Symmetry: C2
Subunit: 49 residues, 2 copies
């Protein structure tokens, strides 16, 4: 009978662990190199004669 196979793993390498930096909603913001603000927007205007 086909059964789930689990390979022999080695101890986790710290260099592999990145999850600690984006496990929370706030972290999603901290992880952004730049946050979206109102004064960053430029609305186009088509003026007619």
């Amino acid at each position: 009978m086909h059964t789930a196979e689990f390979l022999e793993t080695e101890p986790t390498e710290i260099s592999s662990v990145l999850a600690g930096g984006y496990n929370h909603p706030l972290l999603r913001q901290w992880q952004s190199e730049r946050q979206l603000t109102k004064n960053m927007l430029i609305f186009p205007l088509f003026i007619s004669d």
Copy 2:
């Protein structure tokens, strides 16, 4: 009589002109690599027993 002296100047070099990038209040913001937001603040708390 001591009078104001003005030296002979050469035509302005474009590479000298940087003023066009921060002459307006909004430009002061555009010139910032990162803007200050509320979710960037971390308030310290001293809990007593």
